[PDB]
Amino acid sequence: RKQVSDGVAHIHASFNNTIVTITDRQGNALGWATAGGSGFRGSRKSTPFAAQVAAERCADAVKEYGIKNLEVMVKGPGPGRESTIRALNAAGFRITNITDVTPIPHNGCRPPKKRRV
Amino acid sequence: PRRRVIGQRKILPDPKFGSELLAKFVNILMVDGKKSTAESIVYSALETLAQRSGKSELEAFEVALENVRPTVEVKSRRVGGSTYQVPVEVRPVRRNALAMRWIVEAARKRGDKSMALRLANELSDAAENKGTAVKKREDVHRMAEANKAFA
Amino acid sequence: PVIKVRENEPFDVALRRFKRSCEKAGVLAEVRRREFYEKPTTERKRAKASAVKRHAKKLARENARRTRLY
RNA sequence: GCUUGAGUCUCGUAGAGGGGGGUAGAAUUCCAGGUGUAGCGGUGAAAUGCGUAGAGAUCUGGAGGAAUACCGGUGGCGAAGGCGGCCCCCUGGACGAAGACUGACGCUCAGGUGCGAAAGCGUGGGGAGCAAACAGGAUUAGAUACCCUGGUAGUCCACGCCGUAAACGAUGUCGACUUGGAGGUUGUGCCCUUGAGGCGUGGCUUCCGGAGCUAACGCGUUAAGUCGACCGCCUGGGGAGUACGGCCGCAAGGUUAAAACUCAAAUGAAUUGACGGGGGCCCGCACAAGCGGUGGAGCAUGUGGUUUAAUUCGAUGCAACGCG
RNA sequence: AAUGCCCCGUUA
RNA sequence: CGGCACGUAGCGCAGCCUGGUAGCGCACCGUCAUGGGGUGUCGGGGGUCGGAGGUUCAAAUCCUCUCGUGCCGACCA
Ligand SMILES: [Mg+2]
Ligand SMILES: [Mg+2]
Ligand SMILES: [Mg+2]
Ligand SMILES: [Mg+2]
Ligand SMILES: [Mg+2]
Ligand SMILES: [Mg+2]
Ligand SMILES: [Mg+2]
Ligand SMILES: [Mg+2]
Ligand SMILES: [Mg+2]
Ligand SMILES: [Mg+2]
Ligand SMILES: [Mg+2]
Ligand SMILES: [Mg+2]
Ligand SMILES: [Mg+2]
Ligand SMILES: [Mg+2]
Ligand SMILES: [Mg+2]
Ligand SMILES: [Mg+2]
Ligand SMILES: [Mg+2]
Ligand SMILES: [Mg+2]
Ligand SMILES: [Mg+2]
Ligand SMILES: [Mg+2]
Ligand SMILES: [Mg+2]
Ligand SMILES: [Mg+2]
Ligand SMILES: [Mg+2]
Ligand SMILES: [Mg+2]
Ligand SMILES: [Mg+2]
Ligand SMILES: [Mg+2]
Ligand SMILES: [Mg+2]
Ligand SMILES: [Mg+2]
Ligand SMILES: [Mg+2]
Ligand SMILES: [Mg+2]
Ligand SMILES: [Mg+2]
Asked: What GO terms in the biological process aspect are recorded for it (chain A)?
């Protein structure tokens, strides 16, 4: 397979789970990991440690492509916003940019009703 | 307790070697106040373990305690709408006491003939990384690692 | 909230900068707001409650600091 | 006859005021395609559900509907309901300045007329998201609910109907008088605007509070204070805003509106306690951290029950049961 | 950021 | 009028191909929980197969009859 030194890390942090997808600048994915497949289900899925483990696993998976420079694009709220980026830096990818791509509607579709727990 | 922290009480070291650790071990092993019997048992088993594994009683005892020593225990937090089995580090006195307690419990469970023999066998097994003591230590380590997602 | 790590910029400092920029932008607040629909009456009532809370935190604390305690 | 009330004219000011037509960005959904593989979603935890027929994630293009983040502010407008991207056309009202003008033309209003949130109804379109009804999965003793996954009317548009809301400031409209303080917004006169300034003068509005009023809470120049004009409404609670009748409406139902019977209370404000699966602080072997036990066995003792002629009487939550 | 629950006969 | 398929713990259902047991759910009993109940926790008793006959070593279990049961059909004039 081909090798690339510049890539993007799309992080999708939800209130329940966290997704990490490493891709090329053209959005062509190379590898992904999730806190739900990293061994944490239910109450441990929505934790920053599981997010960092998922980031480590995604790095190990995409290791084949030999990536050095990496720009992170984080979306959605949740614990997996900073711990995963820290785990990436630990794995040793040269962070370049840290962007927020959280979809903020301008008073568009109305959200669902409130939970009366 | 709620109000205040307390001061620690003094424990007299053993006469045979002067180890406060051994004094605490015999105080844990004793029952119904039979400190003489506890001292006899512990001294016999320690001499046996020494003449078995070479190095002196102190070295054998400390290596066994180090092999049985834990580092991370687990506690309940009950913060809000969810209960958490959070893992937390252990302090020296606590881990020494837990090691001694697990060792004496394993000795009691062991179905040998004499208590001195039971204790010596358990200590040797712990020194060579065997026995229900190190078993429970590994179990609590695994539980802490599993619940490592809480801090 | 896009930031670019500068030369010799530690990753931790870049993380602090990102957190501060996201705080100034208020993305998590907007997300928590838009997660569930709020009736217009509920929104107006919450706004008026916050307004009276601000009036209190502006007037009563001052009028209380004007006096002593011991 | 008069101009002080009322109204007209000139110049400007602000405004989500109303109607109609276009246009832009984000975002959701869906369709097609590219990378890529084992999970996605969701919950307190799960499952239904979506996925190897390649989901989720990511990237590109396209289709369509709804609402316009930041501005945004106990800010503004409107009689009320209510009104929020930007641009254009039509349009009503309010205010400020100097003068000119008509000269009581004014206020209120039973009937009557019109407007009137949302839901709902009829016809014809449209339909992304949300979501009554409905289905399934959970919780539960049960759960026709809260929770989760989907989801139809409806929410949207045009034309008509409905005419009700805690449609509230729970405070009818108009005019006059009555100490103050701190603001916000919007005009305007003067001083050098020497700056966002200093001196006033009008409209609207927010909070506090004085006399006074009020059952008290509280209102307090925007009065719930002192007065005047007109209208609407009330005469204990339930029965009952119900029945019959009348009018309206396609319908749902709307408006006017009793009686018999029954009770001796119902009710509002505040006060002292108690309680709260309300909040804050603090303590106790209360929990936690440990040791030793009870409940399993035999026996002693008391109790209940049963039996007996009697099996004396009493104690019989914690605070009775090796108790008198 | 919101897993257990429901009930106490009459008069005084 | 014939015929088909039932009869099992207190109740509703298993067990019938296998002839060589009698289950399940609720309920019932005792203890713990509770201030006292319900909910809930545990530990327990349970019927012995509708009734007769014979087959067989042995029958809820195979058949023969009989009871009570629900159902299915009485045609064409
Ligand atoms: Mg949800
Ligand atoms: Mg005038
Ligand atoms: Mg778009
Ligand atoms: Mg696709
Ligand atoms: Mg697109
Ligand atoms: Mg706003
Ligand atoms: Mg106004
Ligand atoms: Mg004249
Ligand atoms: Mg409507
Ligand atoms: Mg319609
Ligand atoms: Mg239609
Ligand atoms: Mg729903
Ligand atoms: Mg259902
Ligand atoms: Mg839905
Ligand atoms: Mg009304
Ligand atoms: Mg009214
Ligand atoms: Mg009028
Ligand atoms: Mg007035
Ligand atoms: Mg008045
Ligand atoms: Mg009054
Ligand atoms: Mg009336
Ligand atoms: Mg009456
Ligand atoms: Mg009526
Ligand atoms: Mg009528
Ligand atoms: Mg009251
Ligand atoms: Mg209390
Ligand atoms: Mg309290
Ligand atoms: Mg304890
Ligand atoms: Mg007695
Ligand atoms: Mg006693
Ligand atoms: Mg009841």
From this structure: translation
Instruction: State how far the Cα of C53 lies from the Cα of A101, in Å rounded to an integer.
Output: 34
> Is residue B26 in a domain?
yes
Q: Is residue B148 in a domain?
A: no
Number of structural domains in chain A: 1
Q: In this structure, what DSSP letter does residue B56 have?
A: -
Total domains in chain B come to 1
CB-based contact A102 C27, cutoff 8 Å? yes
B12 torsion bin: left (phi>0), alpha (psi -120 to 50), beta (else): beta
Residue B9: inside a domain: no
Distance CA C47, CA C36 (A): 17
- What is the domain extent for residue A38? 2-117
Structure tokens at C34: 């838009």
Identify the residue whose tokens are 């225990």: B73
Do the Cβ atoms of C36 and A105 come within 8 Å?
no
Q: Which domain holds residue C12?
A: 1-56
Residue of A nearest to C19 (CA): A82
Q: Is residue B8 a part of any domain in this protein?
A: no
Q: What is the dihedral of CA B109, B114, B118, B123, to 10 degrees?
A: 150
Please tell me which of the candidates C14, C27, C36 has its beta carbon nearest to residue A112: C36
The closest of A14, A12, A32, A7 to A75, measured between CA atoms, is A12
Tell whether the torsion through CA atoms of A70, A75, A79 and A81 is positive or negative: positive
What are the tokens at A80?
A: 């997996």
